[PDB]
Structure 1
Amino acid sequence: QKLIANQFNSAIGKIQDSLSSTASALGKLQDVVNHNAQALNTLVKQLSSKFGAISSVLNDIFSRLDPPEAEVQIDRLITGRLQSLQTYVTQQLIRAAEIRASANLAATKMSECVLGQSKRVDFCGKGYHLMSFPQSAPHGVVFLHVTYVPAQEKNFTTAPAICHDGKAHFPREGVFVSNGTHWFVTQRNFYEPQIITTDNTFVSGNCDVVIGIVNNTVYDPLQPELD
């Protein structure tokens, strides 16, 4: 417990420092802000376009042209600016669809990781997901995914089953490891060897059918009570 708590505290501090120091860690919201700013800028910039008219200032064309001639140029300007606004609206609609997809993903992630424990591989961060914490952002949500990453792996030789008394024994919730010369049962995701017994193994069939079966003893906890 103490080691896990220390690791969690160190990881939280490291996240803090990384967010403080990393130059472009939050690019996925800066991009939205920059896209909105650029869209507004181009919308305003298009206002200065002539669109084939003598001038882009309406008072100028009003002054230097008669109504019959000014009408055509004003129509050109109106069409240009209306088309620019239509393009802006279409781009905003596409960006809104993208943001809606992102928000749906964010809601799903909140539900699965924060309100539960997702069993999906990469949905709540790399490694086996334990829990997640949401953090508010100006235009989004930041998820801190706590995950269990195995480390310091050691190699052991294994067999699929153990033959004892002419019967094949399989591990109930573990794997068989040999430790060179002594067979044990250990959980898959953590090394905790245990003696092979009838409690942690189940029997099915003879040893003639299983490929790779090995000879070893299975200890019966009731055997000692001979009297």
Structure 2
Amino acid sequence: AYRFNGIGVTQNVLYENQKLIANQFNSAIGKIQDSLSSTPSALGKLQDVVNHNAQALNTLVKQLSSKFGAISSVLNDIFSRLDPPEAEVQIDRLITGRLQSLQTYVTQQLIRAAEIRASANLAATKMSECVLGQSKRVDFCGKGYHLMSFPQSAPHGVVFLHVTYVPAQEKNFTTAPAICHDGKAHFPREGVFVSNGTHWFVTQRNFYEPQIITTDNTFVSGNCDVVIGIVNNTVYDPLQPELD
């Protein structure tokens, strides 16, 4: 109920619909396990880390059979069949070729480590802001209005399950910015004036729940001559039946 007040829905909406919200949440979690099981191309982001590290290591061990212009890639074949004073240029060009091979392993390891560091800083921010709290930032913790999140560990990473609110079935209404009752303009305190067609109501903005327009429900600012789309109705003032 606190997390429904965080997204602008009043807290009665949960308690009158509690069994339905629980059923929707349980069916949603079951569809997460069925859909994430029965697809092959999910978790590709964690798979690419393992593939890139293995492929860089296989590249580094397959570059030990490169001659680099020398007559052989075996050091004892350099030290056999050739005297040691002019074998130096071949073995030194082998040391250089293996050494810049090791250097260009290390440089792309540094670049990939910076990319993983940016991803890990984002995951730490998402664990602080989505899991340990409720976020107001749009599309940071999923599509919809964010309710909560749950973490699950994965090999070399983290999976977040974002539970969000989506509005579903909408209706057309006629609306007005203000109500002129007695020469005074009334503005809604925390809602919006809607018309069904014959009578005007005030409702909250994210769920259809109409209310009778009373003085407790609106506030007065100015007179009804300056607002452009103002219409005429009555404002109830609940003290007149309680007068005697």
TM (normalized to structure 2)?
A: 0.91
Which position in structure 1 is the counterpart of 2:162?
145
1:43 and 2:56 are equivalent in the alignment: no
Measured after TM superposition, the shift of residue 191 of structure 1 is 0.6
Measured after TM superposition, the shift of residue 103 of structure 1 is 0.6
2:212 aligned to which of 181, 185, 195: 195
What is the CA–CA distance in structure 2 between the aligned matches of 1:61 and 1:80, rounded to whole Å?
15
What is the CA–CA distance in structure 2 between the aligned matches of 1:15 and 1:204, rounded to whole Å?
50
What is the CA–CA distance in structure 2 between the aligned matches of 1:186 and 1:87, rounded to whole Å?
65
Measured after TM superposition, the shift of residue 225 of structure 1 is 2.1
CA-to-aligned-CA distance 1:106-126 (integer Å, 9 cap, x gap):
000001011000100111001
Which position in structure 2 is the counterpart of 1:81?
98
Measured after TM superposition, the shift of residue 177 of structure 1 is 0.5
Q: Which runs of 5+ in 2 are unaligned?
A: 1-17
What is the CA–CA distance in structure 1 between the aligned matches of 2:82 and 2:208, rounded to whole Å?
90
Name which structure has the greater RCO, CA cutoff 8 Å, separation 6+: 2
What is the CA–CA distance in structure 2 between the aligned matches of 1:216 and 1:48, rounded to whole Å?
90
Which position in structure 1 is the counterpart of 2:82?
65
What is the CA–CA distance in structure 1 between the aligned matches of 2:82 and 2:226, rounded to whole Å?
101
Measured after TM superposition, the shift of residue 207 of structure 1 is 1.1
CA-to-aligned-CA distance 1:121-169 (integer Å, 9 cap, x gap):
1110010000000000010000000000111111111111111111111
Which position in structure 1 is the counterpart of 2:194?
177
SS in structure 2 at match of 1:22: coil
What is the CA–CA distance in structure 2 between the aligned matches of 1:143 and 1:150, rounded to whole Å?
22
Measured after TM superposition, the shift of residue 78 of structure 1 is 0.7
What is the CA–CA distance in structure 1 between the aligned matches of 2:232 and 2:86, rounded to whole Å?
103
What is the CA–CA distance in structure 2 between the aligned matches of 1:200 and 1:66, rounded to whole Å?
102
Measured after TM superposition, the shift of residue 69 of structure 1 is 2.4
Identity %: 100
What is the CA–CA distance in structure 1 between the aligned matches of 2:48 and 2:208, rounded to whole Å?
45
Measured after TM superposition, the shift of residue 226 of structure 1 is 3.2
What is the CA–CA distance in structure 1 between the aligned matches of 2:225 and 2:65, rounded to whole Å?
88
Moved more, 42-51 or 96-105: 42-51
CA-to-aligned-CA distance 1:30-59 (integer Å, 9 cap, x gap):
011111111111111111111111111112
SS in structure 2 at match of 1:113: helix
1:6 and 2:23 are equivalent in the alignment: yes
What is the CA–CA distance in structure 1 between the aligned matches of 2:121 and 2:170, rounded to whole Å?
38
CA-to-aligned-CA distance 1:179-216 (integer Å, 9 cap, x gap):
12211111111111111111111110011111111111
What is the CA–CA distance in structure 2 between the aligned matches of 1:18 and 1:176, rounded to whole Å?
42
SS in structure 1 at match of 2:66: coil
Which position in structure 1 is the counterpart of 2:15?
none
Q: Size of the alignment, in residue pairs?
A: 227
1:211 aligned to which of 219, 224, 228: 228
Moved more, 194-203 or 138-147: 194-203
CA-to-aligned-CA distance 1:86-105 (integer Å, 9 cap, x gap):
11111111111111111100
Q: CA RMSD in A?
A: 0.9
CA-to-aligned-CA distance 1:53-74 (integer Å, 9 cap, x gap):
1111112222132212221111
SS in structure 1 at match of 2:169: strand
What is the CA–CA distance in structure 1 between the aligned matches of 2:34 and 2:228, rounded to whole Å?
53
Q: Which runs of 5+ in 1 are unaligned?
A: none
Measured after TM superposition, the shift of residue 24 of structure 1 is 1.2
What is the CA–CA distance in structure 2 between the aligned matches of 1:223 and 1:71, rounded to whole Å?
110
